[PDB]
């Protein structure tokens, strides 16, 4: 009957362990890629200036 | 298409100007005759050309002419089933032309072009291609043989040559961007296919045989090593080996080997059937065969053949098993080569490089995954054989370094006759580890914890045997004797079968499972016997073991009902007393 | 660029090129095959008749009539980021993964230049490594580079797992903050099979350990060169961050014997007469820089620290593979190997174990005041019961004293109970915690090695 | 046992060791001996 | 059941500390993820002004400048050669090539674009300056002076 209740143990810890890995790994993952968006449109805005430099060197 | 003339002739050796825009290693027929060279240091408009046969007989004025091409494969369907030498040549061909011997200067093809197949080109001009991609199948013994395209081509697909007749040489469809495509194409030894990854070993492998997977598996995509004294068969289990398998296409290739071995193999090969399907053996085989006296690059070239061919299998999406022998002798044509050429030798007497082609020989294997998006088996198991006579000459502690499974046999244990003679006491497997996953899904779920436990019977029977036993079993106390009258189990059905019984010479795993378990399980409960003082020697004739003793012979299909109803009686012997 | 057509001689080893005059020493040049296909080469040997080029993969299919040499770079060089960590990283720096180049930063020599002996002090911290009779009996200290002698059965590349996860700095034990050393790793995997390969994958992905390591890999199936050149890439990695940004590094080689394996092909195409037994006999040498540009920099904070790998090609420590590297690098553990047949794990043992320093990083005011002491100690102990267990075996079960009944089941305690540790980790204080229990069963008037007070301090 | 054997070895690598250096020595002779005539071919 | 009580204490022990260090790695697992996404991101990046780079390059001979800009590459590989022979520059080049079409050491050959080749010194070199050449130097070279210009 001690074993009956070190098994359901296990239960609490378990679930509220996947529980806690499902969800994070979630918001998370979605997160992530929504920040990586956002630095390419960072990027975006001022470009040019690079490709500039690097035809200049190699013109003459 | 380049034209050269001979200057000097220093036997092997020839040198011939007259070449320039020549290619580093290369075929070449030579002579007015013609036979199969090589270059090798090249110079201006000469190079130094390696004829390999006996070149004898050759004068000067002889043109020299290359195909611009480095010794290769060819690969397609129809290879298999036949018998071939180092550089691909298909002996039958060669019987009909020669007589006894094998001439020199004769020249052929591996797949005989007077064969029509019949087909499917499985997809529709007007698409891209892409390398490694689908293209048709034909049957050949039962199978799917799914002839693709060679890697490094893409495009356009126009006009497609529907089903019916062909014969080999002649070509398929086509890219409207120029070039054709044959049925099957040539690849270099050297390289090896490149391939979308590795993939971790973490698959089993069947064999059947008890003592070898469950104590000592290597994983399939694993790769062992077997050394083995001859006189002392070690080829049953190589037969066996092809015999049951767990992959489906067999190849089976050494080279050289003290002549009438190697006929052995020839000769036993046709006579064995499938077991899976109750077709001819042959049907599903590949073998290649190289005799002492052959010449030297040949032999030096044999097992990367070997290798090559099984790729393209591989390729494919089957699961494939080569097997090799003679590993210890593959070294020798190594040393030949770099004996006519001058480069130092270094360690025993095997140049360098000896840790590293020998090396390369193993990697290309383990769990590829296909371009072609499935999964195929390449396997190897390493003969291996000193009449040097050690665990310590360099060839062998090389494999030992970079394979992983090693296998002894050993003629002593051998000769007390309990075949196979896998000597277990010496012999290991790193692989274990990363296949306890699949290992606990798939047979029980307490598995691991069964080998490891059983393992410790022998172990504690050989520190004790050791000494005492130089006063027979009659001197020892309680348990003591109990451990090695189990030891006796282990040693009378556990392992010892047999290769001569079609109830037993095949298992799966579930089936051993029982086996080991109920010998844990009648041996525990032996103890509680002893423990108590009962009559010993006693336990020793109880009606019990004899439903051990026949538990080999189990057939496959009464094996679950077998467990069924003689574990629980074991249950009942001990309260008897 | 200008390039030289004019190859004019081949052989296995190295090939001709004529008219040079600024191709000049150790140049690292591509070639061309003209079929798309590129190769590339060191320039040993120059001259005022012609250059020749250090064939890196082989030689298969050139020609004498097209094809052409191309300066790539005049002195081997690279970049050095602190992008890197994470990045499962092949030699030759193009890595692994799916992610995308290396942004350079600074581009810097690869040989490395020797460092003035006046600008590196004796070492004085102590790394906590997880096993405990290594830091028990024998010291990582910092600076060091100790030595892990291996063999076929021992396992060579689990332990020098272990040591990888398992590593810590301990700034309190001293007194200081912990920020003060941001913790990294090289590692190169340099040689490994199959399996090999796929099992140090895991060990990082685990722990998530992948976060402060680097993983230079090798495959054992590439070209020879490559290998001679993976160690040298890795160890400037480190250089950089360890000088200029300052971190505590930890370099791991492994199984070296795949290195003078692959070394030696070079000589025997070159020719320098390897009068050693299979090696050539300017052995040393290369072996020198290898196993020395670690360590502290006086007037700087962070530093590394060597891990040689390396198993001998029989047991005689007389191949010269194990050998030449007693003398370069200080200290030596080793594995013996019946500690293994009885089964403790992992084995390392402690009867030719050592540490060249251990008089530093030490006693009070850094470690703990009884490292000092209870090193010999333990040593001492250990001693007496081997001396033991050979005259049972030729004499007698009771022709002994009961003065040595002590000694006996003192080795058993040092034996399984000690030394093996399981992969459960121990920390420092744990250790000597232990070590004093260790100690215990001894009567007290015989341990002359101890000062008095921590006698009664501890029991 | 295990000494004498150990003895043994130490013959064998240091008997093998006298030829390494032999062949390499000799070899250098070849290279003369071509080198050499290469230049009592003239002109 | 009085046993019941010891084990119910450590049940809870073992497994709590087995629950936050297994939520670490999950945790590390999501900045691993956020690490991966970025890095992901400066590729893109970075290979993009590389891109362009390209097509403003491949667009110098199309662009009314071109003959102008030939010779003096021209000029630039002409000049590492100390002997000199041959030319070769496409029947697009070549035309409008009138500066060392006039001067050299004589004779103008062949043809094979983004950039020019030659010949000096007997015909053993083969000394050439392609534009992209410098290109796949140079673009290796501003490598992070870029990123930091750009994300700047």
Known sequence: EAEAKAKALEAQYRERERAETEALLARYRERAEAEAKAVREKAMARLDEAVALVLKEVLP | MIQGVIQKIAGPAVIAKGMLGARMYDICKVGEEGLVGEIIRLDGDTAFVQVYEDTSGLKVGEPVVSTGLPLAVELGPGMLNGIYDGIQRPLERIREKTGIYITRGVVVHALDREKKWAWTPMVKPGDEVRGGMVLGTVPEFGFTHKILVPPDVRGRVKEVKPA????????????????????????????????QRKLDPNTPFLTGMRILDVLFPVAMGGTAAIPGPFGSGKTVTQQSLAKWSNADVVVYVGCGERGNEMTDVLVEFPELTDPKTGGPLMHRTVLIANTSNMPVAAREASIYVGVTIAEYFRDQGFSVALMADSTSRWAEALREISSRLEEMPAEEGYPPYLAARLAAFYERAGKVITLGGEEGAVTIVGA????????????????????????????????????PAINWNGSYSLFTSALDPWYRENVAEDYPELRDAISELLQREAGLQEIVQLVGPDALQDAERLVIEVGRIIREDFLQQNAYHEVDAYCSMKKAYGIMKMILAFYKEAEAAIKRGVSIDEILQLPVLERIGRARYVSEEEFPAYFEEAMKEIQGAFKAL | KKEYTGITYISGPLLFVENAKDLAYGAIVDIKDGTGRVRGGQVIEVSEEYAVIQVFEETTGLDLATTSVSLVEDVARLGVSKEMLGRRFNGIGKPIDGLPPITPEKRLPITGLPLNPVARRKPEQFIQTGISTIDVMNTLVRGQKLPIFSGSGLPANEIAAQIARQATVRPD????????????????????????????????????????????????????????????????????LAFEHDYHVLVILTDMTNYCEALREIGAAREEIPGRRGYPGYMYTDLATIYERAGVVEGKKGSVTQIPILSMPDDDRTHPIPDLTGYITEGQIQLSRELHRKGIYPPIDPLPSLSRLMNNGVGKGKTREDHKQVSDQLYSAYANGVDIRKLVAIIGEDALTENDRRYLQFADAFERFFINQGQQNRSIEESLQIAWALLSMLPQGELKRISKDHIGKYY | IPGIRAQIRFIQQVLEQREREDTFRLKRIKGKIEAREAEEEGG | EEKAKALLQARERALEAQYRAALRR???????????????????????????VREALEALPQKPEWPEVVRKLALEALEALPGAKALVANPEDLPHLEAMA???????????????????????????????????????????????????
Do not use: C
């Open chain 2, 164 to 195: 019916g007749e062909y014969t080999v040489e002649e070509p398929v469809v086509v890219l409207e961007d120029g070039t054709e495509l044959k049925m099957y194409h040539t690849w270099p030894v050297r390289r090896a296919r490149p391939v």
């Open chain 2, 384 to 419: 291996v054989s000193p009449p040097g006579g050690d665990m310590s000459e360099p060839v062998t502690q090389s494999t030992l370094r970079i394979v992983g499974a090693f296998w002894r046999l050993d003629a002593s244990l051998a000769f007390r006759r309990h075949f």
């Open chain 3, 173 to 240: 034990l001293s007194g200081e903050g912990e920020k003060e050393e941001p913790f990294a790793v090289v590692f190169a995997a340099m040689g490994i099979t199959q399996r090999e390969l796929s099992y140090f994958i895991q060990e990082f992905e685990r722990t998530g350990a992948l976060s402060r390591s680097v993983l230079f890999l090798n495959k054992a199936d590439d070209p020879t060169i490559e290998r001679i050149l993976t160690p040298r890439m890795a160890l400037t990695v480190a250089e950089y």
């Open chain 5, 26 to 52: 999950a945790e590390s697992a999501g900045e691993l993820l956020v690490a991966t996404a970025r890095t992901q991101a400066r590729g893109e990046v970075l290979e993009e002004v590389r891109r362009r």
């Open chain 5, 102 to 152: 006039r001067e050299r050491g004589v004779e103008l050959q062949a043809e094979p674009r983004l950039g020019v080749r030659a010949v000096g010194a007997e015909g053993k070199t083969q000394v050439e300056n392609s534009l992209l050449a410098r290109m796949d130097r140079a673009w290796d070279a501003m490598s992070s002076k870029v990123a930091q210009a750009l994300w700047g």
